[model samples]
Target: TGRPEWIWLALGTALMGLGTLYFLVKGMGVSDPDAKKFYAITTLVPAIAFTMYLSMLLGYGLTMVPFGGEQNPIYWARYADWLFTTPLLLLDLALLVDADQGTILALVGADGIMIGTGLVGALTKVYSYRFVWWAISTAAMLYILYVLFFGFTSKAESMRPEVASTFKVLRNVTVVLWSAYAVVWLIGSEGAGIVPLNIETLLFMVLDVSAKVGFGLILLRSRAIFG
Candidate 1:
């Protein structure tokens, strides 16, 4: 519906760049017995997720929405979709490489990638890696569901230029929640080993899981509403 080609190209390049950077630079530390396993899993999860997502987007773009439309509604919808979706996809891709695939794959091919990475990382005694996987997977799933929920429901409203409030609130919420989950997992995984199980970690996990399941239900209901 948007500048699908350009958006896909930009996102693909950014994700590929980030994956290369992580592998070349900070990935060195990932070799640590404790951390390697984790990063390996984290890296693979997002890589596969984004790769598959890109494939799906490309496929869908080719099938359902082809050229960039000229109408104000089409124009604005494309812009809004690109402005939000592109960055989020890139961010997740960067994270997948960093976390080794987040050990949790709610989507399709993503879980397989995570499982593969987990096997390898686990073999190398990288036990702490799963947390990052969980954090990222949770965030990604939540964002996706939120986007779909609002994306389908508010399709028409998104194109209106009368109000400056074109931002996707669901997208914003997804970003905020994902960031919070990622930060907590990073701290819990990388911070001093003395960081014990605490309220923050528990709350993060609960909220993350809740976002996914609860939003998922709403999304299901929303589909019925539309139908």
Candidate 2:
């Protein structure tokens, strides 16, 4: 427990649990059918982090992998959390626009590719090869961005003028935070080694809370969903 990782992981666990419990109780009070439906997914978004942080805190969600000749502990649970939460968040936006099922499917499929490449890139041992995978993931993210701004916004506008603005702002929140997520991976211990593992953990903790808990609060209060 005296290890450097203990403090950050413990803090992360607490924050994640707070969001989880908050959403769980909040969901029960939601009376609007649409709000109630959205709340269910929102609750699980933070709820997923509870298990993720708990698993990491107990020493199960990480693995020591060789990175460019040095051994580094990669917390793969973060990716697992992203794999679920990112798509869920994207799904909510697409659902709001009533995007075609095919569009929604492709949006999430692109997400998997983007996240999938990052994990493999992190696990890759070669210094140069990791960058190759990062490029691939970044390319997929470009598509994700296009769909959010182009594919959904037009429909969002036609749906309702108020919802259109809310949708724009919410997706903007996701994109900005998500781009940071991509950059964080690039600079962290598992990527270019610019930051030590402990700092990297704290950075991710901030991003997760902002993207999940913070985004959800703004989203739930928006006229588009709960209001």
Candidate 3:
């Protein structure tokens, strides 16, 4: 077999399970009404990933999209995971700092375009055309980056120092963790083809776990807030 796809898939599923259970247990001890919201989101994020990962592992939801002479696999399941989970991830960040309604909604709205355009871009048959969509998606991502590093940062500073510092850790973590997806597409089988699917699967699995499960671990365990 040319692909060790199963291992990555299984790991993603397994880690997501770990994330879900941790959140469920941790959330139970959380008594703050606002803290509960964060806990709820943390709990749901990895559970969704667990479902998406398993769907790919033992099921069929992927398509082989054409790329000139080659056909790269595009997992609709992956996009489904991003579509639902990323928005909530952004919401999780926004809620922590009490981000304005406009910033929160705008962040979520722009996120949809990033994933939406990214999905179409991957599916496009023409190489150049796919990049156009990728470029558009990148545009959305850059905007979100600006908001996270700047917009969210400024909003975060207005809060108490402890809360502001907590937001700093989470905000920076999102930037580091989330930005890798763009490059993964650029070099991975999906776009530039610098690597194989198995490697791509592995990279995506690491990023997914860190972003979802790992994020909850850091956030929930932190003395970031109790309310």
Candidate 4:
């Protein structure tokens, strides 16, 4: 079944993948290990993840899962993509601020819990139980934001002034984009009764493209400034 929505999603994901590859090649020429790693993490991982997501969505037509004792179609493939990409994203930010190893590991750990809980919540068949997991995931996400904003920002202030400035901008942008995800989750997936699932999917697609592709562009520009 060639759904127009799926086709558009696939097309957008393909475009993002190409953009990611373009930046990845450019990154190879940078000759700075840190900058190279930044592109690989922010651009490369998302490129691969989004490609996988697009594949699953187009091939599977949005896999449905048992939710509240009913068949609720969902984009579970996105959870798979997020599981890997989210930690990489934290790592990219961690590198920018030169966050300590412990901090990096802690942030990654929290991200894992967040994504894991979200996956569980998405598939759970009980309404109340689903909310329980969602609450836990939300807490974990808040912790991640806290680390990036307060903890990482404090560390960035100690870096070279120019690097610190770039870190600040990147951190703020990330926080804003991520916050948008939280709102989307609240109004989209979690608020399915209030918000249409189709609207949720559309919002998610927009956010995903902006958060991953737009974020990559910002990172690349920051690399230019910092390098």
Q: CA lDDT of each candidate?
A: 0.35, 0.84, 0.87, 0.75
Backbone Cα, N, C clashes tallied per candidate: 15, 0, 0, 1
User: Residue 24 CA error for candidate 4 (Å)?
Assistant: 1.8
**How well does each candidate superpose onto the true structure, as a TM-score?**
0.30, 0.94, 0.96, 0.90
The C-alpha stretches of model 3 lying farther than 4 A from their native spots are 1-3
Best model per TM-score: 3
lDDT of 1 at 20: 37
What ranges in model 2 sit over 4 Å off? none
Better of 3 and 4 by lDDT: 3
Model 3: per-residue lDDT, tens digit, 46-118? 9998999998988655889888697678777898989989999899888878898999889999999999999
* Whole-model lDDT, model 1: 0.35
Q: Compared with the true structure, what per-residue lDDT tens digits does model 2 show for residues 1-227?
A: 45577678788788878887888798888788888877888889888987888888898778888867788888899889889998999888887888899999999999999999988987888878988998899889989988898889888877777788878888888888878877888888768888888888888888888888888887777768753
What is the RMSD, in Å, between candidate 3 and the native fold over all Cα? 1.4
The most accurate candidate by lDDT is: 3
Model 4 lDDT tens row, 1-227: 65545654765677677777878777777877667677767766668666765776567535666665567666677787788878887887788777899998899999999999988887777877877888889899999999988899899887887778877777787788777776676566553546666566667777777767776777777743344
